[PDB]
Amino acid sequence: RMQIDEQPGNAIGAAVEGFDHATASDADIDALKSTIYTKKIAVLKGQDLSPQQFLALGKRLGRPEAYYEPMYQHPEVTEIFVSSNVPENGKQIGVPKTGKFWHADYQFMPDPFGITLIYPQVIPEKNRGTYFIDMGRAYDRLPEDLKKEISGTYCRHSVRKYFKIRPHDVYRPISEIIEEVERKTPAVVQPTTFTHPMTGETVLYISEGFTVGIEDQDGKPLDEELLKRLFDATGQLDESFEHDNIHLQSFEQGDLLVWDNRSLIHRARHTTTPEPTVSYRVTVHDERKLHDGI
Numbered sequence: 001r002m003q004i005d006e007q008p009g010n011a012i013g014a015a016v017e018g019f020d021h022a023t024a025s026d027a028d029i030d031a032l033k034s035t036i037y038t039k040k041i042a043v044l045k046g047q048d049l050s051p052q053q054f055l056a057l058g059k060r061l062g063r064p065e066a067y068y069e070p071m072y073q074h075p076e077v078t079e080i081f082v083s084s085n086v087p088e089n090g091k092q093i094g095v096p097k098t099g100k101f102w103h104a105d106y107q108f109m110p111d112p113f114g115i116t117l118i119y120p121q122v123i124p125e126k127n128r129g130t131y132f133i134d135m136g137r138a139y140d141r142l143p144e145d146l147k148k149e150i151s152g153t154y155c156r157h158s159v160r161k162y163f164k165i166r167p168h169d170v171y172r173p174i175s176e177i178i179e180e181v182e183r184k185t186p187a188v189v190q191p192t193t194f195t196h197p198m199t200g201e202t203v204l205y206i207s208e209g210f211t212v213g214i215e216d217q218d219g220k221p222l223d224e225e226l227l228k229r230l231f232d233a234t235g236q237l238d239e240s241f242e243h244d245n246i247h248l249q250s251f252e253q254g255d256l257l258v259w260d261n262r263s264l265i266h267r268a269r270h271t272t273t274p275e276p277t278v279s280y281r282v283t284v285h286d287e288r289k290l291h292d293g294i
């Protein structure tokens, strides 16, 4: 039935053939999750699923959690995060072109989930994909001066930079929305590096989209150049996307991307044209927290 073909050596990614979430065994799920923690990306091939079946597939990997802002939610399945620029019956479903920035999912939240699932529905014919950076691999290749400078430091993550304007936000003062974002989703504090509870790797838990500051042990803020140097060194400032840390993951019809939300930061690659693009997303919590300090 299920057959996992991992990429050779330390290459990122792994293809999964003949996977049926309804008939997959417990050993198939454990082996798949083990591939996600080690190969970071698991591409399920030939997935023809309804929105209800996509949620049932995500339930096999963990406990799904719906996005906190309801305008992203699928009308039928509230646990499905919808990124869509294609109206259905003239109504806007989801939010158009999400995640066009380096980030980890729910990084700005106090308890991020460990597994992210992406099921593209409408795929533009050419320049479409998703960039990826292994922050565990990025920390290992950091310069020694940066490793010891961030030792014992903390980082603050906030969605204040890419919080999308909601339909009911029209005609409201922009400072009224800013204070609402800082009230409902205040900046969370995480250690700059944590230990992956599944693999034991040291993960540099930062992202240009969500990480807004860096502090030492006492919470005393450090110069924001330290964060900018970390973004530059890991490849999050390369607008050409030719950095060695950057991996471009494309997909065909029927692919279902399941990747490690602890180690990986990602960025949506969209066309420079108004070409239709629809993607469904399910995000689940596994048997452990983001790290053993949460």
Ligand SMILES: C[C@H](CC(=O)O)NC(=O)C(=O)O
Pocket: 095, 097, 098, 099, 100, 103, 104, 105, 106, 107, 159, 162, 163, 164
């Ligand atoms: C703000 C952003 C959605 C968007 O780009 O509109 N949130 C996430 O990506 C997530 O953490 O799930």
Ligand SMILES: [Fe+2]
Pocket: 098, 099, 105
């Ligand atoms: Fe995302």
